[PDB]
Amino acid sequence: RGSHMEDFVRQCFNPMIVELAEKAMKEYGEDPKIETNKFAAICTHLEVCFMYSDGGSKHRFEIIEGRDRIMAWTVVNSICNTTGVEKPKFLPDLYDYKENRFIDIGVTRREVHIYYLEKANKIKSEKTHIHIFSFTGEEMATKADYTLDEESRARIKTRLFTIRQEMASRSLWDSFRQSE
Numbered sequence: 001r002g003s004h005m006e007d008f009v010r011q012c013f014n015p016m017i018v019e020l021a022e023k024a025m026k027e028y029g030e031d032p033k034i035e036t037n038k039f040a041a042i043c044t045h046l047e048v049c050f051m052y053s054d055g056g057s058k059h060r061f062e063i064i065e066g067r068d069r070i071m072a073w074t075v076v077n078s079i080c081n082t083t084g085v086e087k088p089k090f091l092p093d094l095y096d097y098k099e100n101r102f103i104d105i106g107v108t109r110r111e112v113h114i115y116y117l118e119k120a121n122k123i124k125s126e127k128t129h130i131h132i133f134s135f136t137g138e139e140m141a142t143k144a145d146y147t148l149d150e151e152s153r154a155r156i157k158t159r160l161f162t163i164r165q166e167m168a169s170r171s172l173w174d175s176f177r178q179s180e
């Protein structure tokens with residue numbers, strides 16, 4: 001069965017992101033053709049992570065998101081075993097070489113703090129930095145430390161709101177917002 005959402009995702013995100021999202025979904029045994037909202041969210045999370053890592057200096061970020069589970073943890077161990085930083089319980093998204101911390105980036109259709117609090121306790125990792133974006137232009141980061149300058153975060157919020165308008169323009173936003 002062919003859904004409008006899957007066709008929208010494929011023509012809205014670049015092929016490298018879609019491929020990474022598919023490999024991520026099947027690696028954890030899920031179908032992009034059936035669980036299509038999740039497909040859309042994984043693509044979105046991937047793009048935001050990539051836009052985020054583009055915000056810093058050249059060597060600033062190590063990218064963990066978008067890798068095989070095995071090599072992602074391999075890089076995490078290399079980072080920990082060479083910076084002494086604590087090994088997070090669950091896979092982060094980036095490591096900040098400038099601020100010497102892991103970052104878990106979140107994208108939500110709820111209020112940023114409803115989402116941050118749950119991400120805070122689920123990790124329970126005191127060290128890992130959290131940065132949440134919403135589809136309504138809000139953000140919320142650990143210690144009010146937003147890592148990147150304003151322009152790079154504003155770029156991310158703009159893109160998130162364009163995705164939401166594109167889904168709304170195709171009547172897929174309601175099903176997407178309710179499915180989280």
Ligand SMILES: [Mn+2]
Nearest residue numbers: 065091092093
């Ligand atoms: Mn991740």
Ligand SMILES: [Mn+2]
Nearest residue numbers: 093104105106
């Ligand atoms: Mn994340």
